[PDB]
Design a protein around this ligand. Structure first.
Ligand SMILES: Nc1ncnc2c1ncn2[C@@H]1O[C@H](COP(=O)(O)OP(=O)(O)O)[C@@H](O)[C@H]1O
Ligand SMILES: Nc1ncnc2c1ncn2[C@@H]1O[C@H](COP(=O)(O)OP(=O)(O)O)[C@@H](O)[C@H]1O
Ligand SMILES: CC(C)C[C@H](Cl)C(=O)O
Ligand SMILES: CC(C)C[C@H](Cl)C(=O)O
Ligand SMILES: [K+]
Ligand SMILES: [K+]
Ligand SMILES: [Mg+2]
Ligand SMILES: [Mg+2]
Lengths: 310, 310
């Protein structure tokens, strides 16, 4: 029953399966209201942006979802609950490319307005609400599964080192595929820590930060691709939060780019969403994402995520 | 002729010694106005604080200095200039303990007022103005000296690694004297950098940050004083600024203390002035001082100082 902001992840264990029903009914009351807020967000977008065909498509997707959700009959039994899950699974899949569609839709249209704070706010609000909604929805679905060491999407004994290693292997492959090599990653600090935690946000954030650090490292070592400085990751685990520091020797973020890197769409090269999205996600969950640039040397990125209150 | 804020450090080279006169005359016009501002600062202190006998003593010192400075006759020749230097040297020495007197005077008296922003502002403004004044004054005196690789107090080829090493040896001695041992310090990054720079601010700041990192390291390793994690210092030198990162494995700054550590007087133990003073000095010179705490692991402190414009 651990909560994200104004949102609650049910921990329940009833052999009869009545927690599924209480969970299902909660989801059913909650999803339409939150989808309505997203729709209100689209309605208030500057006209010229809202008229972009890709933005209109996403706008329609949300209306469609609101329609199907409200059309679904109140849940009275396992049979209803079971069918609601099919709808939720369908919606989750239908909406899996939303971040990318928004990025495309907004890329050009955003420069047609005078106030630039506007799109930042819309995206921060839309993407984090969406993260919140997908977490709740996926958590409900997960309550059906019998994975050990999970209560829904909540890992009961998450190892930060393990999940970091997972995304390191992933980022290294992408990097090897593009450059013929990848920095090695060293992990230090509280490497043996284990605690209850929701992987989902880490699954978004970590690969974004690792891809950044690896790209920077390779692009600054073009003469010695076979011998590049390691990326060093430090884990700090205390009673308040989990801190993951990702340090590279990739030459740093230039002074002229520093005020831009947190802007959606800004890139010196994906589509420039990695940093602002990651920060918005971390702040939404009560944490933060901070950068320290050592121009000429490299960058330290500090991810902080609050622990699950007990 | 490199400048600090609203203040100018004369680079001059006249064999006849006329730059000494132009410098002297500049100092003579500039010191009284700036001392007057400091006096105005004392006049506007909350009554109950201004009545503290130590605060009153410092207040009087500044009046006395204004008196002697204004009483000094306009400078028309080397003889006048030469005598002005004696006065400046006397004043510099008379005022050498001002930071410490202010700290004592304010320690108790400050809690007697409702607005806490007040003392922070007074101290930030008083201490940085004082740094500015001492730099100009000392720079003038230094123009008389014939040290090679100096133009006044400006080192023409400052090595960050060398000046860091100087203060490392110093901090290690203090630390060894108190704990029987001291962390080793490793220095990496742009270790061979050399550039024109004014040592004075580094001479204040570095020992403060080194003492902090060493204390934290020892106090968190009481069982293994003979084997403690190194302090690691990274130098980054680029065209805009010099960055010095000081990282320790001293266990970090606790969440409950984090909002306090930049307050004058706050200490978990000198007199709690190291951090706020160092930050005020760095910002005054166009740089910054930022902390990243990894609670349970350690702390990274980032000092940034702008280069001398050319
Ligand atoms: N670790 C890093 N080192 C150097 N530059 C970085 C680092 N992380 C981000 N940046 C800079 O910030 C920009 C924004 O990154 P991001 O938001 O992830 O979008 P993208 O990776 O698509 O460019 C990058 O294009 C890059 O110039
Ligand atoms: N590197 C560090 N590691 C852990 N704690 C630190 C560090 N630097 C500063 N602190 C904390 O911040 C407080 C304020 O430090 P400072 O302003 O230098 O005053 P003082 O050193 O006199 O306490 C210290 O008492 C200490 O608790
Ligand atoms: C209707 C929901 C499940 C869709 C979420 Cl808000 C998303 O865009 O992925
Ligand atoms: C009169 C000057 C030289 C004194 C400076 Cl402002 C200081 O307090 O040290
Ligand atoms: K970006
Ligand atoms: K302090
Ligand atoms: Mg990226
Ligand atoms: Mg100190």
């Amino acid at each position: 029953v651990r909560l994200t902001p104004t949102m609650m992840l049910y921990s329940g264990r009833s052999q009869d399966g009545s927690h599924l029903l209480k969970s299902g009914r909660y989801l059913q009351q909650e999803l339409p209201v939150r989808i309505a807020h997203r729709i209100k967000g689209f309605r208030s977008l500057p006209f010229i942006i809202g008229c972009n065909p890709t933005i209109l498509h996403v706008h329609e997707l949300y209306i469609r979802a609101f329609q199907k959700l409200t059309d679904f009959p109140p849940i009275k039994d396992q049979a209803d609950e079971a069918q609601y899950c099919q709808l939720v699974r369908q919606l989750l899949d239908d909406h899996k490319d939303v971040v990318t569609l928004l990025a495309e839709g907004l890329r050009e249209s955003r420069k047609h307005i005078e106030d630039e704070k506007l799109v930042r706010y819309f995206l921060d609000k839309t993407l984090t609400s969406r993260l919140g909604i997908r977490m709740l929805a996926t958590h409900h679905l997960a309550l059906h599964e019998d994975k050990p060491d999970f209560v829904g999407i909540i890992c009961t004994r998450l190892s930060p080192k393990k999940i970091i290693e997972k995304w390191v292997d992933f980022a290294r492959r992408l990097c090897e595929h593009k450059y013929g090599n990848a920095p090695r990653v060293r992990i230090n600090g509280h490497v043996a820590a284990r605690f209850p935690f929701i992987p989902m946000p880490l699954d978004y954030i970590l690969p974004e930060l690792l891809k950044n650090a690896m790209r920077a490292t390779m692009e600054s070592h073009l003469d010695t691709p076979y011998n590049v400085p390691d990326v060093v990751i430090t884990i700090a685990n205390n009673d308040v939060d989990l801190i993951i520091r990702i340090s590279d020797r990739g030459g740093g973020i230039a002074h002229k780019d520093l005020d831009r890197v947190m802007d959606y769409h800004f890139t010196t090269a994906g589509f420039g969403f990695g940093l602002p999205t990651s920060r918005a996600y971390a702040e939404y969950l009560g944490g933060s994402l901070q950068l320290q640039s050592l121009q000429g040397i490299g960058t330290d990125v500090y991810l902080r995520l609050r622990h699950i209150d007990g």
